[PDB]
Design a protein around this nucleic acid. Structure first.
Lengths: 146, 143
RNA sequence: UCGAAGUAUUCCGCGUACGUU
RNA sequence: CGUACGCGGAAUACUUCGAUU
């Protein structure tokens, strides 16, 4: 069965990908490692008070194989350029080719920032279009005028 | 209880507003009427060969959801028209009818050429959802 | 921020069924 | 395109619990 690309095994490994260093060798769509803060650093930051957070959460799904990232974002132009490099059409299509094939599945990209979530979703045979819409939506959300 | 601001009866009317369309007076966020094709017109169109008849969009304030299908043939005259299906005003005005002190989940969703975009978040960021939804709609309909 | 549970919706993919708007 | 399901996920909102006892 070629449906190890979808079996719960690769699913758990894709979820574990966020925290390990790719342990087991699972290919990821992201080009930068996770930066999610600790409970204590998160608790301490939240002093004044949901606005201007530490960063944003994004994820790429290929069927039920979901990868997640939390990246720091200081709302500066330099930081914007840094976090916009967390993934690219190339890195997504490369990673997607490891979990797609035969029957079409649903793919999605999701990003949350300042209490606003954007999800681009569709069939795996439209992935290139998802990427183009995903990168453009990521720019606007992170630069959304307050 | 007794909040019919987000009741099953109001969820049904908002769903019926697409077809009713104005029956009972339910305030909709859309300014244009539904243009959904019939089964046959949708068939004959696909029998012609990418470029669909139009697109689907919907606004949700909690469980109260409004839907529209609008024709869109990839022209500035058609883009400007369908961009007028709703505005920030028409959304906020409609939302204030289905929102109370408790924050609920609001969302805008649009599907075009096999791609679907959904902007969601708490009713406290509705102004920000509107700004994102309009930029997303224009971007999607324009590649 | 992380994990888990429930509740209310939506979205995508797949499959089934029924249609004159 | 519409309606009704069934399956598999995801997203959002709200709620509860745990996170070098």
């Amino acid at each position: 069965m070629e449906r190890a690309i979808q079996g719960n095994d690769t699913r758990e490994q894709a979820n574990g990908e966020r925290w390990d260093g790719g342990s087991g060798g699972i290919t990821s769509p992201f080009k930068l490692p996770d930066e999610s803060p600790s409970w204590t650093e998160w608790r301490l930051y939240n002093d004044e008070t949901q606005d201007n957070p530490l960063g944003f959460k994004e994820s790429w799904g290929f069927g039920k194989v979901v990868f997640k990232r939390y990246l720091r974002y200081d709302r500066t132009e330099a930081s914007l350029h840094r976090v916009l490099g967390s993934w690219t059409g190339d890195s997504v299509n490369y990673a997607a080719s490891r979990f797609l094939g035969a029957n079409q599945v649903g793919c999605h990209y999701s990003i949350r920032f300042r209490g606003v979530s954007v999800t681009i979703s569709g069939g795996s045979r439209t992935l290139q279009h998802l990427c183009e819409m995903a990168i453009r939506s990521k720019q606007e959300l992170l630069q959304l005028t307050p």
